[PDB]
Design a protein around this ligand. Sequence first.
Ligand SMILES: Nc1nc2c(ncn2[C@@H]2O[C@H](COP(=O)(O)OP(=O)(O)O)[C@@H](O)[C@H]2O)c(=O)[nH]1
Ligand SMILES: Nc1nc2c(ncn2[C@@H]2O[C@H](COP(=O)(O)OP(=O)(O)O)[C@@H](O)[C@H]2O)c(=O)[nH]1
Ligand SMILES: O=c1[nH]cnc2c1ncn2[C@@H]1O[C@H](COP(=O)(O)O)[C@@H](O)[C@H]1O
Ligand SMILES: O=c1[nH]cnc2c1ncn2[C@@H]1O[C@H](COP(=O)(O)O)[C@@H](O)[C@H]1O
Lengths: 413, 429
Amino acid sequence: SPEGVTVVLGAQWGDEGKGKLVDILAAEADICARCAGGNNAGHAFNLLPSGLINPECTAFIGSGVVVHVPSLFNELDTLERKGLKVAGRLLVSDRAHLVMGFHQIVDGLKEVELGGSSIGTTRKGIGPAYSSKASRSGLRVHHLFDPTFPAKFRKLVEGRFKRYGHFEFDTEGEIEMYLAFAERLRPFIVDGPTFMHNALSSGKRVLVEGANALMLDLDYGTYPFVTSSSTSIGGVVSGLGISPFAIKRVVGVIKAYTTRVGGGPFPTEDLATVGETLQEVGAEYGTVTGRRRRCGWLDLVVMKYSTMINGYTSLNLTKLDVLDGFEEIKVATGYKIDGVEVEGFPADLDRLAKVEVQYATLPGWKTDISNCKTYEEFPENAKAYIKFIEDYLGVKVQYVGVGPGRDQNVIIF
Amino acid sequence: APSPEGVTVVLGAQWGDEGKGKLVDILAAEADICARCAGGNNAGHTIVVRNDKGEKTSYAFNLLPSGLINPECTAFIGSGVVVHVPSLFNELDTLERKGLKVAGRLLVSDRAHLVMGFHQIVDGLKEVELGGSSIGTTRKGIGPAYSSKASRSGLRVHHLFDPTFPAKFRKLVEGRFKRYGHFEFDTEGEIEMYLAFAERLRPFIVDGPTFMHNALSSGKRVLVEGANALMLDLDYGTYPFVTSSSTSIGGVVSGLGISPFAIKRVVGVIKAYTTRVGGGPFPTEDLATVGETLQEVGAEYGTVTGRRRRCGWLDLVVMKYSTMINGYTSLNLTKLDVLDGFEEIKVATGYKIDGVEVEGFPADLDRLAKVEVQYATLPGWKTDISNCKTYEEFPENAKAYIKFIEDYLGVKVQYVGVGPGRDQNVIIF
Ligand SMILES: Nc1nc2c(ncn2[C@@H]2O[C@H](COP(=O)(O)OP(=O)(O)O)[C@@H](O)[C@H]2O)c(=O)[nH]1
Ligand SMILES: Nc1nc2c(ncn2[C@@H]2O[C@H](COP(=O)(O)OP(=O)(O)O)[C@@H](O)[C@H]2O)c(=O)[nH]1
Ligand SMILES: O=c1[nH]cnc2c1ncn2[C@@H]1O[C@H](COP(=O)(O)O)[C@@H](O)[C@H]1O
Ligand SMILES: O=c1[nH]cnc2c1ncn2[C@@H]1O[C@H](COP(=O)(O)O)[C@@H](O)[C@H]1O
């Protein structure tokens, strides 16, 4: 690992296995950071950087993140209860924005207001928090120590009532609770820009855990079926307030098949037995919610676009073991509209809907690879699958996931 | 001096109005593509060109990249921008009537967001609603457009060709009516106007990611004209007295959808004294004769009622912070001539709160309000430098001012502005 920043980014529509790779690479990092997004889960980490199992790794929450403070401490207190010493190893930018209870409520209210046109958000208030941020009415970590916090909070609620009508919300109770958490948060708070600048100047190795994934990027994803932050490489630069020159590696986490959860287009979605098999074998459902994910074939048209935006220096191909039982595996290699090859990935979703997907069909290996520890142990047709992806995308696969465990990662170089 | 293949960025380093236009003009001569990556129509530049008959012509740019002044350049509006389409075409048509060809050389990302008439209206309504706590926005709808973008209700360039555009537009109006009450707005007339602009815009529309990727892979020189400035950055500026885009270097990466590895040069535009427009603290602000002198000699008035500029000494605590975030490869020191009449010049070198040295720049504005500013006092040069064309010509104490800034920030000054005229610059290296 070089001095400077190594980034782990999700390449598709999330749930690729970023947390797993971060836990692995954090063994070689001084600092593990979140740069954007809010609380969404990885395998017990949600808001906290997934590198904290390394006892000596420091966790940092950047200015680009939106933080639901009660959830942060529920997460922290649980980790500590399990025996992990986190409290002295966690720093939070005083410029991070605050997700409030009413953000979570109006997230759902808007989704209902949309009816059939709903996005399928996680209902965690992420969009409303980022919209308040853009408006500059949003509250930030430093406001927790500002005597005007209650007045500003009340006005925020009043504005949501105007927009969405009355809803039940204990405004004064929520204010009281947040200020109570402020006392617990105080020791974690830092000036983010100077913290990161000092780290980089000192020759530290910084590992950045991207949230969500590229096709959920507010600018470059399948808008409006996206999250409300930059999930892509620019979000690292902005979210941590660092120079682009500090970025040394950008690892793209690419699942061996495609998933998305929530609404929007999905060109290689399978609505029959393949999709069901990927869902079951790949355990593609929410850990607490049971929220089942849409599944389909690997889509390298998506990956070509993803690579164009993020500029991956290498790939982590994940969940390859989920395909161990397949006789044949399809991989999307092109989109056509009206018999004509499509350039790049379309911004217009009605154009995307006209796409006829072109597939390669590759033979399966029909072998359990979950105990493979080196590239040479892979079955020939698994090797072929890896090479097919590399050759198509022009980026080498550096890491292969063959099971959920920390140990089930094959390092190729 | 040749520009490198890849991306050169011009960024404002303070609170705007530094004087970015002249450097963009200088660097556009060595650019293939000139791009806007974020922000809206607050990048007003006028470039005055002398022709082969010795006559001067003034060309005005705002949404359009100023590098169009180079007739061989292509202009690009990135995905991260918010576009008021009526303004865009007013700007374009004004230039073409003056003989500057724009159509055919202008490309617009189909993922850029649209600033609508109702965004401008509610910008104002919110500002009124805030009373004494107003931000001092330019009332151009920029915040409301970025808020709608974050909500994912906002409309993008591709929607102009979408059969559901009228229905979606109506729903957006309806939402603003719920939040702010009914204001006068000709919804159906506006829809019609936008469908008309859509046909004018059709030839310009491009897939932004592909356009830029192909440009970079074919070795093009891309100049990015940053809008606003670092201390107006949504994340890193004096929030809430900031704009609603990333004005910092990350907004280039996001706004153009490129790899950070494509960034080659990042020039920070640092005015020789500090100005602010809008509320909140201003550590080096002068409310007496120095501030009045800076305002008059620097012509720091702006073009809109209520936006006359607050003026103060150069603040290098601000500039250290700005440099940390943006990673400048060199600096453009502007309006150095505005100090030509000063006997002594103060420069902020440190902040203290409660006797202790603040490190970096404080996120909390109540802490910022408490800062005790430490100043260096430098001797003036008391000579007119506005006809200087080479570094050697500078008076010793102007040289000393430059060097003081360099040594403090650890970044060299490459370009010095010594007047408003197109060629009133000194290139040091
Ligand atoms: N079978 C299998 N499961 C994996 C693998 N990698 C990760 N997982 C699991 O797949 C799911 C997605 O991983 P996670 O780290 O939470 O994704 P993230 O949101 O991108 O951080 C989790 O349930 C993981 O335990 C793999 O290589 N094989
Ligand atoms: N006296 C003086 N005026 C300058 C100088 N550089 C730029 N200006 C003027 O400052 C004003 C703001 O410049 P502009 O390029 O529009 O600034 P921007 O807001 O940073 O993009 C313009 O009227 C310039 O002509 C300089 O070096 N000296
Ligand atoms: O961690 C994640 N995994 C998978 N999808 C996500 C995740 N976070 C957000 N999304 C999706 O992003 C879109 C917006 O959700 P939001 O981020 O809750 O506003 C929806 O399609 C979500 O399902
Ligand atoms: O170009 C600029 N020069 C100086 N201040 C600006 C500029 N653009 C935005 N601002 C300031 O940024 C804040 C937000 O304005 P907005 O970008 O119109 O929303 C206000 O304090 C403005 O005065």
